[PDB]
C-alpha cells in the first residue's frame, strides 16, 4: 500500500501554481463574445 501523503504533498504546490497560472489564461468571458455578467439569467 502506497501512502496518500507524499502524493498529495507533491501535487498540491503544482495545483496552487497552476491555479495561479490558469487564472491568467481566460479568453472567452473577458471578451465581447460573452453577453452576460456571470449570473445565469
Amino acid at each position: 500500500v502506497i501512502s496518500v501523503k507524499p502524493i498529495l504533498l507533491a501535487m498540491t504546490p503544482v495545483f496552487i501554481l497552476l491555479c495561479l497560472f490558469f487564472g491568467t489564461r481566460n479568453g472567452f468571458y473577458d471578451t465581447d463574445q460573452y453577453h452576460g455578467n456571470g449570473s445565469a439569467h
Binding site: 500500500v1 502506497i2 501512502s3 496518500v4 501523503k5 507524499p6 502524493i7 498529495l8 504533498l9 498540491t12 504546490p13 495545483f15 496552487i16 497552476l18 491555479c19 495561479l20 490558469f22 487564472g23 489564461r25 481566460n26 479568453g27 472567452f28 468571458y29 463574445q33 460573452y34 453577453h35 452576460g36 455578467n37 456571470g38 449570473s39 445565469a40 439569467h41
Partner: protein
Amino acid sequence: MSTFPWLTTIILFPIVAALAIPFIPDPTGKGRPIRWYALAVGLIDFALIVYAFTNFYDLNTPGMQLWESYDWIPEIGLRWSVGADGLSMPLILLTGFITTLAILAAWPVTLKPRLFYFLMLAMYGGQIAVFAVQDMLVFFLAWELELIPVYLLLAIWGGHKRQYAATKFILYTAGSSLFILVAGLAMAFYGDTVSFDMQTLAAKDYALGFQLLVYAGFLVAYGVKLPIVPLHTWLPDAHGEATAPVHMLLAGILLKMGGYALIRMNVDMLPAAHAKFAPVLVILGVVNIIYAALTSYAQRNLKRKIAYSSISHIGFVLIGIASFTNLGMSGAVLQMVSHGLIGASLFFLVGATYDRTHTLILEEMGGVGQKMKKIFAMFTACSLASLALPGMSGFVAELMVFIGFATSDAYSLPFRVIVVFLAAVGVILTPIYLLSMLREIFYGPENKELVEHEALVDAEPREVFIIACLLVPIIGIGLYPKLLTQIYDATTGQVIARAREVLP
C-alpha cells in the same frame, strides 16, 4: 507545530479574510482584485489544510485528531471544540479542493463581485466548520451558517425562478436545523451531565424510545440536507436555478454534510435506533436512486436534470450507511467524496455550456458539439464518470456499497436480494438519461436557429484546467481506491464495530 490551532485557523481564516473584501481597492468595478484575492485565500487555506493533513493527521488512528477545545461559554457548555476524524478529513480536503476550484470557476461574475466572493469565502469558512467541530451547539451554528450565504448566492445570481428557489431553500433548511437543535438539546440533557461534546454524547447510554425520537428528529434534519426523496423538493429549485460555482459547492459539499452527520450522530451516537431504522434507510436510498434517475430522465431542463442526478447518486450513500459492514460504510464515504468531485465537474460544465448557448432546454441546443469540442469532450468524460464507469471513482464506491450490503448477514436473504436487485436498476437508468441528454445537447447536426443568435465559443484553458483538476482525483481514486480509503478505514472500522453490538 502540533500545538498550533490548525482547524480553528482553517475555519476562521476565510471568514477573517472575507471581512477584508470591501477594503480591497478596485477602480474598474468589474471585480478582478476581489477574484484574485479570493483565489489567493482559497489556495492558502487549501495549502494549510493539506499541510495539517500531511503532518499532524495519522492514518492509523480511529479517534479524533487535530484536537482543539477552547472554552467559549462555560455557562451552557458551549465550547469551540474542533477535531479531524476519519469521517471528517476526506470531506475537509474535498471542501478545500472543491471550494478553491469553485472560486476559480466563479471568475465570469461581474454583477456584485465583492459580495459574491465575500459569500464564497464565508461559505469556505463554515463548510469546514460543519465537518470540523465536535460541539453540538457549534454544529448547529455551523449548520445554519449557510442559510444567508446560499440564499444570497441563489437570489442575486443565477436562474429565473431564483427567488422562489432561495425562499424555499432557506425556509426548508431552517425548519430542518430546528430539528438539529432539538435533537442536540435532547441528547445533551439526557442523564446528569450537560456535556455538549460529540464524543461524550456518543459515549452516553440512551434508552430506546429516546433513541428513536432523537433519530427521527435527526432523520428529518438530515433527510432534508441529504436529499431523501420525500424531503427532496428544495433541491431541484435551489439547484436548477444556481450559478455553476454556487451549484458546485452547493451539491458537491452541502449535500455531504447531512450524510457526514448521518454517520456522526445517527450511527456513532444512536446505534440502537439505527438498527431499527436501517431497513427504512436502505429502502429510501433505493427509492432515491430509482426515483431521481426517472425524474432526471423526464427533465427537459439541463440544470434540473443534473440536480436530480445529484439526488440519485446519494442513494448509494444511504445504502452504505444502513449496511452494517466495513465495506458498505467505506463505499458510502467513498461515494460522498466521488460524487462531490464528479458532480462539481458536471455542474461546472453545465454552467459553461449555458454561458455559451444561453438556454437550458434540451429541445433547443442541437449540434452544439460541432462548435465547442472541448466542452463536448469534458462533458462526455464527466458524464461517463457519473455512470459508475470503472477506472473512475464513481464505480468503486457503488461496487463497494453493493458488495458490503449483500454480504451483510444482519439482514434477511430476500431483503438483500430485492434491494440489490432494485439498487442495480439505476445501473441501467443512469446511462439512459445521461446519454439521452448528451445525444440531445451535443450530438447530431448543428442547430442553426441557435448558432445565429449565440456565439458558440469553445472552452477556455481555465475551464479545461478546472475539469482536469476535478478528473485527476476521480481517475486516481477509481484506479487505486486505497488512496482515499486509507484516510478513513480506521475510524469507520471503529464505527461499524461500535454499531454491530446491537444486532442479534
